[model samples]
Target: PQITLWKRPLVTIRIGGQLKEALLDTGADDTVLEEMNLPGKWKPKMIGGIGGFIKVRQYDQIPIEICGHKAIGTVLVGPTPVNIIGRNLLTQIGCTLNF
Candidate 1:
């Protein structure tokens, strides 16, 4: 299955058994969630974006379902304004940008 990329993309996903809305950020290289207590060891790391820098918990090999596509990779949990589905998962779901 394929999902059309929007100008300002958004998608419904399931993370940690909970439904969530996330921004499809093609500009980002990683996924970042608002917050979640994932079952795994995590490391504190600092990340920067258009919104500046923030400290977040980095958890690797986390699984999430994006519009039914199963994806696993590093996910950052923090005080982000919005949940972001970046290129990491986007690539797995086969996202493409065009008119």
Candidate 2:
């Protein structure tokens, strides 16, 4: 589906059977979600954003359903202002920017 960048591209995504709203951030390289106790083993890691670098939990190969599209990849859990579906997951969902 084609999307216009007139406003923030927000979409619905499902993780671990829980539905949540997330932004389709094309500029972001990695997907970051609000801190939550997801049932999985995660490794501590750091990520940088507009504000600064922050510690996050890297959960690899997590199954996520983005706007009805299924994707299994890495999802970062941290103190993000909002959930972001980044390029890693975007590519998996075949999302591309076009004029």
Candidate 3:
């Protein structure tokens, strides 16, 4: 079957007055966050990664309200500097990533 292209509006995630740009990735089964932003508040849980076992630890799970629609899930902030919304968050949405 041919795939239908889908794209979403640019999203901004706020954390302690910090805002970051996030792209919607439906293929992603979970939400990807910056490990550095993972403060003591975000209760992160241990999860698996492509390489091996990883931690999905976060202090809190916030409501991601986009274009009036919202999703309540825990975001995993990664230690890496550059942040991008990968398959993790994309899978949650009922849409697909066109870009």
Candidate 4:
């Protein structure tokens, strides 16, 4: 199915551990790795985002949490800024947006 990508997120993902400011973009397709068990020397790379092509190091697959929900997926790692959640998470609850 085609996920919608806008400039903003309808819902947000709140996680425990070392997770940072995250948005629940029903639009994004990749699952963000907040604190997965990854290598210390994880490399960096570039990929497409809501804005444009962005660079981020490949991280490990950590379990992410939402409003009473949780899922394990890969998120943008390294010193790169992060964004919204994807199908790996939303599908767990089968959620939609209010707006």
Q: Give me the candidate number with maximum TM-score.
A: 2
Q: lDDT tens digits, residues 22-70, model 2?
A: 9999888999999889988999999996788989999999999999999
- Candidate 1 Cα lDDT to native: 0.87
Report the lDDT tens digits of candidate 4 across residue range 1-99: 223556544344554454445666566666544333454455566767557776566554556666556776556653335555666667765667653
Off by over 4 Å in 4: 1-16, 19-21, 32-44, 78-82, 97-99
Which pairs clash in the backbone of model 1? none
> Against the unseen true structure, what C-alpha lDDT does each candidate score?
0.87, 0.92, 0.54, 0.57
Give the per-residue Cα lDDT of candidate 3 at 74: 62
lDDT of 3 by residue, 8-84 (tens): 54476554545666655544455666655444576546755466656666644555543334565666765533344
Question: What local lDDT does model 2 show for residue 94?
Answer: 95
lDDT-based ranking? 2, 1, 4, 3
Candidate 1, 1-99: lDDT as tens digits:
445653556779998889999987888889999977778999999989776899999999998999888999989999998999999999988888765
lDDT score, candidate 4: 0.57
TM-score of 3: 0.48
